[PDB]
């Protein structure tokens, strides 16, 4: 069992630079055969891993030359030079000189955008839902960069810290972007008893919350 | 072209067995190596088991013993017999085919869903979103679908039978009480719905679940 070691777990790179993934084996990966079957692998949100080379340098039909793999022993290296959005995802390293053959633990490639505030959309709950007794109301913050941001509830005023879901999707290809989803769940008769729903973004692009609401009132 | 199919994957209970398949088909089969390889939930890859050419087979500790890696030659189609399930056999599966002499996983299907749990398969259930009260902001809606309650994974989202492709966002499902919670969102101009329409196809293959939810304009 030779522990592959992949560092970073994440990495930054704005688009035109060069990146560099380390993949580091606990025993040589040479065999007695002369060779080292050292990999590396791309997996794309959504997707199957791809090879993209083996044997420490050999590039798979069809991967560009911006691709480059190199090292020995137990250190080896992965560059991508030219980065293009399309190379976002997370990149993998194997060995096959020993068996079990390993993966490394991943590293996952972030494209660097300019800062994006987040598009708010807020939603109550569908009649449908109400019918069978429960009521979610569901806000989305869409296209936003950097990944981190954050959440907050309010019913009538009041910040609502228990019954939320939050979920982000991987780094999009298209935009660079992120975009992420925030549900409220209640009962139905909790909902019923109360007027203003709200949702607070707060982002790095703003010292202030964007918000988005509705009144039951209101039609 | 070389292809591979996986299929079989669903839910099992603690210590039960499973057999996944995989169809293979434009390339000669007997020829080259063939592997399962799992990733878990954390993300994480591991080779599961191979059998090459001249027919021995290979596995790891973790899975030796209970797990039996198979192939017909006449019909192109890799096995995985699975036996003993535990909860950390959880995982997507896929199969893969060599490049040459043991060289590289050149070649790797969509993968199959394999669930081992107690719980009970539970249906999703769709909900439409749309906004409480139409004003302002620019000219282009956004519309959802909130797919609550269900199990296991996966579930599969498209709108308009997949020919609304652009502006849509669908967030990774979350767990909580044994039950997985997902949604997705649809960005169109106003000029558009709700007199063009805007449907949200849910599919959820583990309870045979398939609907098609037709997003409306609230009432009062
Ligand atoms: C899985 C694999 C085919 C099976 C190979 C594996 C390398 C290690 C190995 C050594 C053996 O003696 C049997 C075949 C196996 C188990 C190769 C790594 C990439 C390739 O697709």
């Known amino acids: 069992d030779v522990v592959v070691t992949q560092t970073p777990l994440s990495l930054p790179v704005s688009l035109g630079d060069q990146a560099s993934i380390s993949c580091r084996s606990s025993?040589?990966?040479?065999?007695?055969?002369?060779?080292?079957?050292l990999e590396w692998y791309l997996q794309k949100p959504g997707q199957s891993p791809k090879l993209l080379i083996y044997?420490?340098?050999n590039r798979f039909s069809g991967v560009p030359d911006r691709f480059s793999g190199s090292g020995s022993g137990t250190d080896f290296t992965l560059k991508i030079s030219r980065v293009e959005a399309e190379d976002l995802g997370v990149y993998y390293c194997?060995?096959?000189?020993?068996?079990?053959?390993?993966f490394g633990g991943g590293t996952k490639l972030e494209i660097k955008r300019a800062d994006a505030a987040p598009t708010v959309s807020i939603f109550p709950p569908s009649s449908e839902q109400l019918t069978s007794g429960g009521a979610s109301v569901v806000c989305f913050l869409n296209n936003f960069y950097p990944k981190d941001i954050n959440v907050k509830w309010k019913i009538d005023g009041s910040e609502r810290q228990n019954g939320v879901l939050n979920s982000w999707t991987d780094q999009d290809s298209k935009d660079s972007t992120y975009s992420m989803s925030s549900t409220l769940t209640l009962t139905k008769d909790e909902y019923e008893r109360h007027n203003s729903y709200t949702c607070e973004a707060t982002h790095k692009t703003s010292t202030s919350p964007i918000v988005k609401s509705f009144n039951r009132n209101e039609c | 072209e070389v292809k591979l199919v996986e299929s079989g994957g669903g839910l099992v209970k603690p210590g039960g067995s499973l057999k996944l398949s995989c169809a293979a088909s434009?390339?000669?089969?007997?020829?080259?190596?063939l592997s399962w390889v799992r990733q878990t939930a954390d993300k994480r890859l591991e080779w599961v088991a191979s059998?090459?050419?001249?027919?021995?087979?290979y596995y790891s500790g973790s899975v030796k013993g209970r797990f039996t890696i198979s192939r017909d030659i006449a019909r192109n189609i890799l096995y995985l017999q699975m036996s003993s399930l535990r909860s950390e056999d959880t995982a997507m599966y896929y199969c893969?085919?060599?490049?040459?002499?043991?060289?590289?996983?050149?070649?790797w299907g969509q993968g199959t869903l394999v669930t081992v749990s107690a719980a009970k398969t539970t249906p999703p259930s769709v909900y439409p979103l749309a906004p409480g009260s139409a004003a302002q902001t620019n000219s282009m809606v956004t519309l959802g679908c909130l797919v609550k309650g269900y199990f296991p994974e996966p579930v599969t989202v498209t709108w308009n039978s997949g020919s609304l492709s652009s502006g849509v966002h669908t967030f990774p499902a979350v767990l909580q009480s044994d039950l997985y919670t997902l949604s997705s969102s649809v960005t169109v101009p106003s000029s558009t719905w709700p007199s063009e329409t805007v449907t949200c196809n849910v599919a959820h293959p583990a309870s045979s679940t398939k609907v098609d939810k037709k997003i409306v304009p609230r009432d009062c």
């Open positions: 893969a085919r060599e490049y040459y002499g043991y060289v590289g996983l050149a070649y």
């Open positions: 434009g390339f000669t089969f007997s020829t080259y190596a």
């Open positions: 025993q040589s990966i040479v065999h007695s055969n002369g060779n080292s079957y």
């Open positions: 194997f060995q096959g000189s020993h068996v079990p053959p390993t």
């Open positions: 044997k420490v340098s």
């Open positions: 059998i090459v050419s001249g027919g021995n087979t």
